Design a protein around this ligand. Sequence first.
Ligand SMILES: [K+]
Ligand SMILES: [K+]
Ligand SMILES: [K+]
Ligand SMILES: [K+]
Lengths: 386, 86, 86
Amino acid sequence: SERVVINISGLRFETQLKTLAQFPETLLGDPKKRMRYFDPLRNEYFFDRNRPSFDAILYYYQSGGRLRRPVNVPLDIFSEEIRFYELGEEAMEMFREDEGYIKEEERPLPENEFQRQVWLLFEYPESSGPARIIAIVSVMVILISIVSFCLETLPIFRDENEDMHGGGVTFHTYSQSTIGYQQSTSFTDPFFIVETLCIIWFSFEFLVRFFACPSKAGFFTNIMNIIDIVAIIPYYVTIFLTESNKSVLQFQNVRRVVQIFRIMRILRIFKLSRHSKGLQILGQTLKASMRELGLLIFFLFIGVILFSSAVYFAEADERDSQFPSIPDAFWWAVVSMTTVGYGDMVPTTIGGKIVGSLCAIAGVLTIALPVPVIVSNFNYFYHRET
Amino acid sequence: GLLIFFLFIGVILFSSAVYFAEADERDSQFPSIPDAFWWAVVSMTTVGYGDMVPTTIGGKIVGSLCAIAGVLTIALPVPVIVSNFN
Amino acid sequence: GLLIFFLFIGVILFSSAVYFAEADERDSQFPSIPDAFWWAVVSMTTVGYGDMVPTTIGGKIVGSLCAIAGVLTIALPVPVIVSNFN
Ligand SMILES: [K+]
Ligand SMILES: [K+]
Ligand SMILES: [K+]
Ligand SMILES: [K+]
């Protein structure tokens, strides 16, 4: 079992030749590659290189594959050494992964001279000046669609209709109040105009992206595309629903569904996430914190039921009890544990107040336990980008 | 900036939901979505004055979520700032 | 245990001061020191329902201090607990 001496800038290392022959494609494992570094006067291979790194390089052979970077050695210096000793692409990949680096993909255009041209200014805002323009306009349209959706609820506008003084219930007024705007081919309502324009553009982007994208299979997998769709679904579904129930009795029978889709319109806010690095980071953060986010909700649930129950019974024998039932106390318990404390429900008895005191303290600890982990994940994804 | 931005997103999201959830109530404390912005900020920062509160079951579910969302929203960017200060 | 203990100390200390500070007011919301315990806990944990509030200048100075003291009181032992959990 012939021994080999490797001198790293004066620091002496020794191993068995069979330990190095284990990996024939590396510098040290290949006689022809290491020949260049042999000093026949001293019977050693000499490398005028970084010292703190070699330990791990040699341990990789002794361990049979373990490549751990020493805590005291910078990742950029170590990786250069892994490359120098020619440990190979597999070890390198295993290293980066374990080091917290895994990326890989990129679907370019089909090389259509057309598709690749359209796709570049509809997803890569830096591809060109026009690309930016499209992105800027997209943000403006999103912001406008939000402001408009909100103004639809202002009394100055909605409180001005055919039955604003409790007179009747006009079918056109009843659906205009439910939907938020007047749907008519005449386009009299400025709100319907703004909403239609905005949805024309959202519809445009979604279409242009669906036909200029390299793959149509990994499309409805991208959360961004899902968002793009959700942003237009309400509009078209409302049209369909109103035209399929064009009578007072019918509409009244589908109003709940119509209302649900009106609320869904606010999800268009998330369209900004395509232009917000932070919103993307937040997204990555939440995806990685599902477990802790679940514990948060779970512990809060336990505390809510526990405290709601106790305060309910503690106030039960009082004529002025502010707790009609345990389920109703859930509200008070959440408002107390999160320390919001509106004051619309409060215990009035000594036992209720002892329960409330505990409820508050329990809330602070309950929330405090899982949050830090989430904050940590965010801090990680946040700097990894910064 | 992220703090203000995330809070803005949450404010609009929660103001919208609570508004519609209380809309069909004669005693609704939310005249419009923009007016609910106040309640949403007061809840997310956990101030909770109590001058505007939901009264329906759907409004209270929205409010509960709004409070929890506020704690996490603020909690995410602050630590970095605290670090810079330190 | 330290959490509960420090809170207890602060509760009694602040309940006492606010009680005496509001004592000479016909509309005092603090019937006795033990009754003020409630207000002091609700303030130190920053819940702030608003069902009991000081109305005098001295009561409000006491209340201001009570709130700040609460934040530091809770903040001291919690981190350790959060650490054990982590
Ligand atoms: K608070
Ligand atoms: K509060
Ligand atoms: K409060
Ligand atoms: K209050």
